[PDB]
Design a protein around this ligand. Sequence first.
Ligand SMILES: NC(=O)C1=CN([C@@H]2O[C@H](COP(=O)(O)OP(=O)(O)OC[C@H]3O[C@@H](n4cnc5c(N)ncnc54)[C@H](OP(=O)(O)O)[C@@H]3O)[C@@H](O)[C@H]2O)C=CC1
Ligand SMILES: Cn1ncc2cc(-c3ccc(C4=NC5(CC5)C(=O)N4C[C@@H]4CCN(C(=O)C5CC5)C4)cc3)ccc21
Ligand SMILES: [Cl-]
Length: 632
Amino acid sequence: EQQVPILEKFCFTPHTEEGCLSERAALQEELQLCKGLVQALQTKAQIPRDPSQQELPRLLSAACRLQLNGNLQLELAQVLAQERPKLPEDPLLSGLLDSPALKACLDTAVENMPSLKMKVVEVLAGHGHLYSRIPGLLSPHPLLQLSYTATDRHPQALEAAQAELQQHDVAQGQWDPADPAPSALGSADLLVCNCAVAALGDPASALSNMVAALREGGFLLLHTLLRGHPLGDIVAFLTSGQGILSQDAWESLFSRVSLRLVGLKKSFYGSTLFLCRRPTPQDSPIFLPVDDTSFRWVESLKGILADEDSSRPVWLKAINCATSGVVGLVNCLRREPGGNRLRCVLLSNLSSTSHVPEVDPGSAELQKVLQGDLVMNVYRDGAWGAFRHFLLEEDSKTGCPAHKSYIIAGGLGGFGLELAQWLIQRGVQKLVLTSRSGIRTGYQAKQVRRWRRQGVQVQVSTSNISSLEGARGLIAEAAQLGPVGGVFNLAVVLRDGLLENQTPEFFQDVCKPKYSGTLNLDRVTREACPELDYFVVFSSVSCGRGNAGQSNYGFANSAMERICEKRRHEGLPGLAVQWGAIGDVGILVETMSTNDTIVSGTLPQRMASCLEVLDLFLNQPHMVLSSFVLAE
Ligand SMILES: NC(=O)C1=CN([C@@H]2O[C@H](COP(=O)(O)OP(=O)(O)OC[C@H]3O[C@@H](n4cnc5c(N)ncnc54)[C@H](OP(=O)(O)O)[C@@H]3O)[C@@H](O)[C@H]2O)C=CC1
Ligand SMILES: Cn1ncc2cc(-c3ccc(C4=NC5(CC5)C(=O)N4C[C@@H]4CCN(C(=O)C5CC5)C4)cc3)ccc21
Ligand SMILES: [Cl-]
């Protein structure tokens, strides 16, 4: 019966995060217990619910048992070797793998792929078990194809997992990281290794051979435990394995093998996800500002990317506009010809208090960004990072007071009429629907006639929000009916086409109702709408994910999202909703059809689902949300 959409929040995510998982009391308690069981040792049942029933506490207690009589010094080899393959499921030894930290690293890798494909190799999968996590974490990507190979030194180490491996199209191989990689595993896009449990052996040699297996620009994801931290020291004590190094040692090792560090997730107890990258021979970068409002820079970019012969990296710089939509622009152009040449920098501070770093050609900061060579480089309030998607949690209902006015920009549109209907039946008695040319269809006129016959005061306005004057006039109209309780920007103009077929004027057209419109709506509601409860813009997966031939559209949407973020930061209402394909009504169904037409591995979301999801979203504290329905 009902569709089940995937719901996510779109958050700015620092490259470096520390103290992670500190809010997980179940982990805090378990860590305390383990700390006790080692201080005891040195000095001398249903699903595990209490922190003492977990794998590592169990092992430690069994080592106290031996410590009493049978002697751990003699039996440790058989107990450790016994419970070894089960230890990676300990909550602490896999906290980061279970957290969104893993997803954040994987998505960073995917984002920096030149195409929607990734060749993956897992080292020491027999105890790493990352093959049972990564494919599932990336399966929501409707287009991404993975080529995954699980490898290990001892061919039998992956025997008990032959079923799941083969059944989920994961290839198997033999590789001791001590040696060089089989040539077949070469030119890998991503090498992963969970050596929190797995015997890494000599890490210097191991890392050297891993890098060699990566392509230039390829990524290494390493999960491990740090010396000088509690969990690392505890696991080390049980070792009497080798491969448990301090962070300084790790970073020295990365330098020694040329690995560039570009990501770092550290838990409060010292478990760590290193995201490293093999360098690409730095060709002289090109630097193009995109802050020019005339979008003249579009013509410049046309010329640059027209040069098919060149491999010059193209860096788009947005340093004088926090509400730039460069991120959305890039997500689209990356899917267009020469898109792999693209990177970007975006200075987007939410606080005017915050310091702006200098990223002119020749700065330490800019050179540091270049060495990383990441596609997405967003500076925000003291931290470098990028917007990432994360699984929204579960969570009341939406009712509107009869005396408040509600505005829908683009209200006579497909989604707009359905939104008006939904708002009404949630109590709305005062509606203002805007349109550049007023009513134009019998369908539109009919719904308005109905709503009026029901008693709903429905005004149809032509006050163009793309202008500050027209905007100001619009809220005046709504005010004449009652205090503006909410605004909903559903206005859109399309000027699709590859960038080679784009113009600055087309970009201006597309940005008029979305970018300029939402700016003016932000300004006037701040001034004259003190009872505004809702400030909702409708964005798209075209912005949040990217879509060839819609770069201007991605830009406009992305800019709206930035505005919403600033608004929420200042306590004002604000919400961008990245919609996937929408069935029943709207532009898409006009070309064409509701159900049947699979759209890039996703399905048009039925309006029933859409409104149900919108209800959930309107009652969230998050700035940017996403909804789409996966096909198959
Ligand atoms: N349809 C889909 O599948 C998806 C849609 N979205 C977003 O959802 C929203 C609505 O989608 P949808 O119903 O399909 O599109 P529609 O084209 O059906 O309706 C939106 C309307 O905006 C009006 N409009 C354009 N410019 C202005 C302006 N300056 N002031 C006032 N009205 C204006 C247009 O009509 P007119 O020219 O007469 O003024 C059009 O009727 C948009 O923001 C779109 O980007 C996102 C993802 C998927
Ligand atoms: C989790 N995840 N990861 C990656 C990813 C990518 C997408 C995704 C889906 C669809 C498209 C897409 N394809 C076409 C050409 C047919 C197309 O038109 N689109 C854009 C959709 C369908 C219509 N859309 C609009 O915004 C219309 C202009 C109003 C959105 C683009 C990307 C979704 C989720 C994703
Ligand atoms: Cl790239």
